[PDB]
Amino acid sequence: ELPQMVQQLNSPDQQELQSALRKLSQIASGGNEQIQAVIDAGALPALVQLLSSPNEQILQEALWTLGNIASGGNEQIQAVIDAGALPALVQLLSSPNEQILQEALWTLGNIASGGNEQIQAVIDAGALPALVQLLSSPNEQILQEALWTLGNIASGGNEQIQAVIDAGALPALVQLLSSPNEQILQEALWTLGNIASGGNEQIQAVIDAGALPALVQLLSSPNEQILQEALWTLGNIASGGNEQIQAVIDAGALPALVQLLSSPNEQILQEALWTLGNIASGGNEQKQAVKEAGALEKLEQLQSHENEKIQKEAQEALEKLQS
Amino acid sequence: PTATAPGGLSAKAPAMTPLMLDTSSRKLVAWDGTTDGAAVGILAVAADQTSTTLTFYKSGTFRYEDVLWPEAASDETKKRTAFAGTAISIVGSGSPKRKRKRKRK
Ligand SMILES: [Ca+2]
Ligand SMILES: [Ca+2]
Ligand SMILES: [Ca+2]
Ligand SMILES: [Ca+2]
Ligand SMILES: [Ca+2]
Ligand SMILES: [Ca+2]
Ligand SMILES: [Ca+2]
Ligand SMILES: [Ca+2]
Numbered sequence: 001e002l003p004q005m006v007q008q009l010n011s012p013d014q015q016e017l018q019s020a021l022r023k024l025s026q027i028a029s030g031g032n033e034q035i036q037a038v039i040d041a042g043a044l045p046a047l048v049q050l051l052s053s054p055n056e057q058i059l060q061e062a063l064w065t066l067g068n069i070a071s072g073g074n075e076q077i078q079a080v081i082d083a084g085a086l087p088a089l090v091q092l093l094s095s096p097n098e099q100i101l102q103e104a105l106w107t108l109g110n111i112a113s114g115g116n117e118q119i120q121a122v123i124d125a126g127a128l129p130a131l132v133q134l135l136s137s138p139n140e141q142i143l144q145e146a147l148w149t150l151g152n153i154a155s156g157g158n159e160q161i162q163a164v165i166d167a168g169a170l171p172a173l174v175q176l177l178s179s180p181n182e183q184i185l186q187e188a189l190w191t192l193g194n195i196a197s198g199g200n201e202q203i204q205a206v207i208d209a210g211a212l213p214a215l216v217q218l219l220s221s222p223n224e225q226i227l228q229e230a231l232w233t234l235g236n237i238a239s240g241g242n243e244q245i246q247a248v249i250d251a252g253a254l255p256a257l258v259q260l261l262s263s264p265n266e267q268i269l270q271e272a273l274w275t276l277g278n279i280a281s282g283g284n285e286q287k288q289a290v291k292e293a294g295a296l297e298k299l300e301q302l303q304s305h306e307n308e309k310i311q312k313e314a315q316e317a318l319e320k321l322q323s
Numbered sequence: 324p325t326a327t328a329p330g331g332l333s334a335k336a337p338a339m340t341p342l343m344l345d346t347s348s349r350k351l352v353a354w355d356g357t358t359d360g361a362a363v364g365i366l367a368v369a370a371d372q373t374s375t376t377l378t379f380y381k382s383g384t385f386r387y388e389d390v391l392w393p394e395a396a397s398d399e400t401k402k403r404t405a406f407a408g409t410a411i412s413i414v415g416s417g418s419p420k421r422k423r424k425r426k427r428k
Contacts, residue, residue: 029428064427071426106425113424148423155421194421270418277415316415 002027002041009046021050021061028068035072044069044083051088056097063092063103070110077114086111086125093130098142105134105145112152119156128153128167135172140181147176147187154194161198170195170209177214182223189218189229196236203240212237212251219256224265231260231271238278245282254279254293261298270313273302277317287321296321325367330377332370339391340366341405342379351377354405356396362405365390382410388417 008020024043027034043065050062070080085107092104112122127149134146154164169191176188192215196206211233218230234257238248257279260272276299280290290296299321302314331350341354343361354362364379387403390413396402403413 026428029426068426068428071424110424113422152423155423190421197421274418 002037006041006043006046009043009050018058018061021058021065025061025065025068028065032072032076035069035076038069039076039079044079044085048083048085048088051085051092056100060099060103063100063107067103067107067110070107071113074114074118077111077118080111081118081121086121086127090125090127090130093127093134098139101142102145105142105149109145109149109152112149112155116156116160119153119160122153123160123163128163128169132167132169132172135169135176140184144183144187147184147191151187151191151194154191155197158198158202161195161202164191164195165202165205170205170211174209174211174214177211177218182226186225186229189226189233193229193233193236196233200240200244203237203244206233206237207244207247212247212253216251216253216256219253219260224268227268228271231268231275235271235275235278238275242282242286245279245286248279249286249289254289254295258293258295258298261295261302266307266310269302269310273299273310273313273317277313277320280317280321290321324380324382325378326364326381327376327378330370330374332372332374332377335369335371336366337369337391338366339385339389341390341392342366342377351379354393354396356393356402359401360405360407362411363409365411380411384412384414386414 002024005020005024008016009024011017011020024038024047027038047062047066050058051066053059053062066080066085070077089104089108089111092100093108095101095104108122108127112119131146131150131153134142135150137143137146150164150169154161173188173192176184179185179188192206192211196203215230215234215237218226219234221227221230234248234253238245257272257276260268261276263269263272276290276295279286296318299314299318302310303318305311305314329348329350331345331348331352333352336353341362342351342364343354343358344350344363345352351363364381365383365385366377366379368378370377392402396405399416406413
C-alpha cells in the first residue's frame with residue numbers, strides 16, 4: 001500500500017497528493033520500524049522535492065514528515081541526509097515565514113541529534129552562520145529552536161564544537177545568560193555545557209567569552225533546572241587543565257559549591273561533588289583553595305551517605321584531593 | 324611508548340579501543356567486554372579489518388572517560404579490572420547523556 005502513496009506524492013491530482021502526504025506523515029510518527037517502512041518505500045526524494053513547493057500548506061506538511069523521520073535512528077537520519085534535505089533546509093533558514101522557519105529548525109535539530117558524521121553534514125551545509133544570526137532574534141519561539149539545534153550540534157566531537165566557536169556563537173550565548181526568560185537561559189546554559197564537554201582549547205574559549213562570572217552567580221539560583229545546567233557547565237570546565245581549573249576558583253565558585261554540599265537533592269549533590277572532584281584533581285595551588293573553602297570535612301562526611309552514587313562521588317573527590 | 328602486533332579486527336576501531344588476543348589467529352582483536360582480564364592493550368592509531376599491523380599502548384596511565392569501552396562491557400569494576408596483569412592503569416567515570424530527539428504529531 002505504501003509505494004502507491006510515494007508515487008502519489010508526484011501525482012497531478014491535488015486530493016491524491018495531499019491524502020498520501022497526510023497518511024505518510026501519520027506513519028512517520030509511529031516509531032522507527034514504521035519510519036523505516038516509509039524510507040524503504042522511497043518517500044524521501046519526493047518529500048525533499050516538496051520543500052521547493054510554492055504551496056505553504058504542502059511545504060509545511062512535507063517538512064513536518066521529514067522532521068518526524070529525523071527523530072528516528074542514525075541510519076534513518078543518514079537516509080534523510082543522502083536524500084539531499086540539508087541544502088533545502090539551510091535555505092528555509094532565510095524564510096520570512098515563522099511556521100516554516102520553526103519547522104526547518106526542528107528538523108535540523110533532530111538531524112543534529114545523530115552521530116558525529118550526521119552533525120558534520122549539518123555543518124558542511126552551512127547551517128551554523130544562519131543559527132548564530134537567529135540568536136539575535138526578538139522572536140522567543142525562533143530563538144529557542146535555534147539554541148536547541150546549536151546545542152545538538154555542540155553535542156558532537158571536538159571539531160563539531162570548534163565549528164560552533166568559530167561561527168561566533170559564544171559572545172551571544174554569554175549575553176543570553178543575563179536573560180530574564182528561564183527557557184532561553186536554560187538553552188543557552190545547555191549549549192555552553194556541550195561546548196565545555198570537549199577538549200582544553202574549547203574550554204578556554206568559554207572562559208575567554210566571559211561565561212564564568214554569570215555561571216558562578218547562577219549557583220545562587222532557586223531554580224533547580226538552571227542550577228543543574230550551570231553546575232554541569234562549571235564541572236566540564238573544571239575537567240580541563242590546571243589554568244582552566246584556576247579560572248573557576250578566581251571567579252569565586254568554591255564558596256557556592258561548598259554551600260551546595262548541604263543539598264538533600266541527590267541530583268544537585270552528585271553534580272556538586274563531581275565539580276569539586278574535578279577541581280581537586282588539579283595542582284597543589286587548586287587543592288589548597290578547596291581545603292581553604294572547607295570542603296574537606298564535607299567530602300569526608302558525604303562518604304557516609306546511604307546512596308552509592310553520592311558515596312562514590314564523595315570518595316572519588318576526597319581521593320583526588322588528598323593524592 | 325607504543326607496541327605493534329598483527330591485527331585481526333572485523334570492523335573499524337578508533338584510537339583508545341581496548342584490545343585482546345585471539346587464540347586462533349594469534350592476532351589482536353577488539354576486546355569483547357565479556358572475557359574478564361583478557362584486555363592486553365589500548366589502540367593508539369585508528370585501524371580496521373584491512374589493517375595488517377596495529378599500533379597500541381602496552382603500558383601507561385589512562386582515564387576511564389578517554390577509553391572507548393565496548394557495549395557488552397556493563398560492569399564498571401570489570402572494566403577497571405580488565406587490564407589485570409598488564410602495565411595499564413585506569414581512573415574514574417562521569418554521569419549522564421545529551422542527544423535530544425523530539426517526535427511529534
Ligand atoms: Ca504559495
Ligand atoms: Ca513573517
Ligand atoms: Ca518578542
Ligand atoms: Ca522570567
Ligand atoms: Ca571534559
Ligand atoms: Ca525552586
Ligand atoms: Ca546534566
Ligand atoms: Ca532527597
